[PDB]
Amino acid sequence: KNVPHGAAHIKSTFNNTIVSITDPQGNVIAWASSGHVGFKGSRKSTPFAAQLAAENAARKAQEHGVKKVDVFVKGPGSGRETAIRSLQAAGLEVGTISDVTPQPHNGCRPPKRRR
């Protein structure tokens, strides 16, 4: 296939970052995860792991014909900064940045506080 323009979905949790490049109709074409680049355990929560995953996903989208992308960040800040920086640094042009984080209108009960 050849998709010149697509979207980038970055989900940065507190212990992992998942980057997926997506044909704008919503179809994932190449994804790289924090644990997919050789990290495991707490090591995959670091910004460096997010950098590696973003670069790997960028290459796995680039050889598929993706040139310009727009990023949808999501999740508590762990490696979003480095994720977008690495997406740019791997030769993938960034169109727009959008923060789409699921924000409930006070629905569902959160788990009890740790100690």
Binding site: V73, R80, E81, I84, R85, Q88, G91, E93, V94, G95, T96, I97, D99
Partner: protein, 255 residues
Amino acid sequence: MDVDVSTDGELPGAAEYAREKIGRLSRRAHRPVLHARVRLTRHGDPAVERPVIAQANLDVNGRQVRAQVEGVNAREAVDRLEARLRSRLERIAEHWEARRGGVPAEAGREWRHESEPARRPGYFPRPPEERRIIRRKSFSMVPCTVDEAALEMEMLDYDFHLFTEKGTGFAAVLYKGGPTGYRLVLVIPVPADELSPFEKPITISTHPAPCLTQRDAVERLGLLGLPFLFYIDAAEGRASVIYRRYDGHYGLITP
């Protein structure tokens, strides 16, 4: 576990009792114990209400734990010494279960001596509420070369600088490229040959400056965390460089 008891005077049976009572504390210590010694003494003066004095010293993996008690007889002194040593070893543990409630927790709630210091940016916070744009420089748009732009950088003591290039006729921004040298960003990326000749070791950013609005530019700067953003304004159609100022507002440099 092996214990040596150095008694003194007449204390018949105290040695065996102390040995067997103290040797049971090896399981209590969370680290191997080495050369655990006990000493029993009796006060010569009958005027002392608690004449027997017991001392114990243990070497728990290099950490010295010592205790001392007084008693009316060998048995009571040994028992009190055992209780004291148990309390000391309990306070000594240092394993995770005993050091887990003192490790700093959460992100902002609670503060401790070793709690991670707050990350503070160079600029005054000035949150998005009334952030505003209250600094608009338009220093120079006379055409310049790379070396001339670098000199105009240096005496201005500014990390980045927006000028217009000689050869291209296009707006460009130079900045310190870190250990790689300097980096040049143009509104439309061009190779070095079209760019005017230079002697400084620099590199050119391959990406083009995108087209986007003022609010979108602020959002991109916030979500991208760069010290500045160089872009072609959507409404104006010309170059613009926004940087977070030294007072918390955004500094928009326009032609």
